[PDB]
Symmetry: C2
Amino acid sequence: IETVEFRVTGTTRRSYSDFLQNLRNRLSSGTSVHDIPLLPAQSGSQQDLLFVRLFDWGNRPITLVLNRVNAYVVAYQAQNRFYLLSDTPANPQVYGNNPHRLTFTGSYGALQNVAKSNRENIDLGINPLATAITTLHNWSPPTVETSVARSLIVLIQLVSETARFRAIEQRVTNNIIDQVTPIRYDNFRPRVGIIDLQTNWQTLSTEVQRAEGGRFLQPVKLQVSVQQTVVISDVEKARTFCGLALLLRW
Amino acid sequence: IETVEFRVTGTTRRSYSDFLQNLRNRLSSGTSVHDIPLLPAQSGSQQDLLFVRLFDWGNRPITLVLNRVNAYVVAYQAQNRFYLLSDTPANPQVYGNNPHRLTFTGSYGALQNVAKSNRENIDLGINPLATAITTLHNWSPPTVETSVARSLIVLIQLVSETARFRAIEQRVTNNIIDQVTPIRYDNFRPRVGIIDLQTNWQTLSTEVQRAEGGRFLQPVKLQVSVQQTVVISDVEKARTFCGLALLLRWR
């Protein structure tokens, strides 16, 4: 299992983008379809994992565990214990003999319920990222899980979702104000567009792989406002407009 | 004149983005408004200018002259002669004694008329960028101006418009496929959305400067397609969604 590292200290637009590119490279199978990296196939019951070690402002680390098949978070390590989402397959070889099982899955529906907060109302940026790392670093049972789910909402979006979509990466990059010194870090919240993009990752991935002449057999509608939807009908649009950056293998 | 360079050979997402960021840093007045650089006020001096030297696949260069006030092209140099847009004031100290004046301005209306092509129908990417450089490198009057206007449409969008809008930069970097060997360079054509963004740069710039508690006095409607729209109502959305990256100083 490989490890990709990211440190909040000194973060620039460039350093965040370099992190995500390194992450995509190591998540990827090394083959590409329509110029977008293809994630590995799930092979039998074999677990194909990747570590992402993140350091907060005080140089305190946690380690996310990602499934390379879908680029998604399945567990994290904090202070020499692993914490698993409820649906994460057991792996004592990696997680130890007695990791802590959280009571929730990694779906946004579940995370938001446990966090008691919709992700439309959760700030995303480098400061939230650092806070999420610190919160996971310090949390231990028997404390209520609220802040764990909240922190994972932040982390999953700033690691997995930005790896999947350069359009989401760009929102982050647009808020790393590195043309000034000291660097300033602003926040945004995802709205209807980003949320619908996240939900459509599998659909978009499949359509790219099934495309004939680069054209989608089933064009994908994406919300741009509460009232309106645009249609993604080809690989060029998926790559250019959505910044689709990793493909879930179909 | 202060010069910022870019070469197509070996282009990666990182090298293109580094170029644009260095460009923004030199264009900027240094003043920051809601974490977006404010462009300078016009001084009437050479301090207002910036050179952008661009190299094609054979390292043949042309130098764009930008006005720092608006981050826009006013002239270019090719093979030791300057070429001025029709509205660009003469300046022997910068442009030499015998520059050639083109018959059109830099407005998209004028450029598209001369090019005989709307920019919705013009490929953008690293290969178009290289071709535009080569075309300007080799062109001289009295051949017709068609290809000069076409090439300027490409270069203005890939230098000025991407400097102004990180959302446009994103389109470009999403099409630099630098994780394969050899690096591949894909093309896109700007959507109704991209064109409307370009059209609204001054409006967005002004709304950012006049905003109260970050809220726009006049929300800005933008096309995302022919049939669909969004509304930008605050500075954070302008910075985050539009990637507004330089502000035209108001006003």
